[PDB]
Design a protein around this ligand. Structure first.
Ligand code: HEM
Ligand SMILES: CC1(C)[C@@H]2CC[C@@]1(C)C(=O)C2
Ligand SMILES: [K+]
Length: 404
């Protein structure tokens, strides 16, 4: 625990550890939701991970993400060393500078590319699931959650699948470090991988996402090799460690709730709405901002240089935003959340993510309508910048399945 700074009043201290929260065994979202109990202020200080603020309510989280003048993305990760090393584009930039880079990232992960890839995405989901179907069991994280998103990303980026274990290792060190590598070491190893590839593809442009970024333009001028590398690194992290984790939360929930499976089997047209409500309930990202200047925010004195975690996960779990927030209701009238962020940094990969999620729900429930958590299994979550599921053993009776 880091010594309490003199400017932080003792009454605002709640020593929450974002990388190993105390209530983790209850589930990761539940573990974070302790910050939303009635006795906890809207804005707390934790002495964990070097000391930082945490906004605990949707109203404050949204407000801070909108106000880039006071809350800068220049240093968006905790601990400070990670945030300081963090230089991915566009995320480490504030408007006005940030904006031009979004358009280029959209050329590779935006709606047009999602439309291009939809066939291969559907094909891979169907292929993976049909292969598992007659087995009556799987290790979901290894057998589907990882390969389905990752193999599609590797295809899009024109990278060999043999590189997956290395890259997945590095990306996991930036979000849920095991202690072997600092964020800076993992980032530099990712850049080390990308540097020769970016040079190659600037010399001989191709069709893949790295080529497109590396040869792209931003507001009418050429992207630099450095800028390309900083954007490609971010795309790799997004491709390898977002949907991969979310799919497991969703499938764990469905495995534990026959009534929700029944709902989507009976009325498959509800799947997009289900996706949205699952994105709220099993929201999984938490990054933040740095104070650009001394600022009074909701009665609290923040100091220039203070880090503030603004957990995207927390907005939709806020009872003030959503009644009975821990309850999954596919018919929820107003699904309020910031799962894909808020303000000028709104997720660029969300259209890809939604497609991958919706394709998975549709194709899984078609073939394996009934399934459960393996007898006696206790599902363990993990927490970090992006939270996840350590393992998800599923079982089903093959006699309840259908080959398409
Ligand atoms: C369930 C899946 C996903 C979730 C929950 C998610 C969440 C987020 C969040 C919360 C942010 C804002 C971060 C901030 O403001 O500091 C963000 C930004 C971003 N995401 Fe996603 N993401 C997902 C999938 C993806 C995928 C698959 C990609 C593909 C590479 C991607 C690419 C990006 C990029 C490039 C940004 C930066 C936009 C900017 O800074 O202007 N995301 N994402
Ligand atoms: C917080 C994020 C999900 C967003 C895309 C990948 C991620 C880890 C980032 O560094 C920005
Ligand atoms: K930085």
């Amino acid at each position: 625990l880091a010594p309490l700074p003199p400017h932080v009043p003792e009454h605002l201290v709640f020593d929450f550890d974002m990388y190993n929260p105390s209530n983790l065994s209850a589930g990761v979202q539940e573990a974070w939701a302790v910050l939303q109990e009635s006795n906890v202020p809207d804005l707390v200080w934790t002495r964990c991970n070097g000391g930082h603020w945490i906004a605990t309510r949707g109203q404050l989280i949204r407000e801070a993400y909108e106000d880039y003048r006071h809350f800068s993305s220049e240093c968006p990760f905790i601990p400070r060393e990670a945030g300081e090393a963090y230089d991915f584009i566009p995320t480490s930039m504030d408007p006005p500078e940030q904006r031009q880079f979004r358009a280029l990232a959209n050329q590779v992960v935006g709606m047009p590319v999602v439309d291009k890839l939809e066939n291969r995405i559907q094909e891979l989901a169907c292929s993976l699931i049909e292969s598992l179907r007659p087995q009556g069991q799987c290790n979901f994280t290894e057998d589907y959650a990882e390969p389905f998103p990752i193999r599609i990303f590797m295809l899009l980026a024109g990278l060999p699948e043999e590189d997956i274990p290395h890259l997945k290792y590095l990306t996991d060190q930036m979000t849920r470090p095991d202690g072997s590598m600092t964020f800076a070491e993992a980032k530099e190893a990712l850049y080390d991988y990308l540097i020769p590839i970016i040079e190659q593809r600037r010399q001989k442009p191709g069709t893949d996402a790295i080529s497109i970024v590396a040869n792209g333009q931003v507001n009418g001028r050429p992207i630099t090799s450095d800028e390309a590398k900083r954007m490609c690194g971010l795309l790799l992290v997004g491709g390898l460690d977002t949907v991969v984790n979310f799919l497991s939360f969703s499938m764990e929930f469905l495995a534990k709730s026959p009534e929700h499976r029944q709902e989507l089997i009976q009325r498959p047209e509800r799947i997009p709405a289900a996706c949205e409500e699952l994105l709220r309930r099993f929201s999984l990202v938490a990054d933040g901002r740095i104070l650009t200047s001394d600022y009074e925010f909701h009665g609290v004195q923040l100091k220039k240089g203070d880090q503030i975690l603004l957990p995207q996960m927390l907005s939709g779990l806020d009872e003030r935003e959503n009644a009975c927030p821990m309850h999954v209701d596919f018919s929820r009238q107003k699904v309020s959340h910031t799962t894909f962020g808020h303000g000028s940094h709104l997720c660029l990969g969300q259209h890809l993510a939604r497609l991958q999620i919706i394709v998975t729900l549709k194709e899984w429930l078609t073939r394996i309508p009934d399934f459960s958590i393996a007898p006696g299994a206790q599902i363990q979550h993990k927490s970090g910048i992006v939270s996840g599921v350590q393992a998800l053993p599923l079982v089903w009776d093959p006699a309840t399945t259908k080959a398409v």
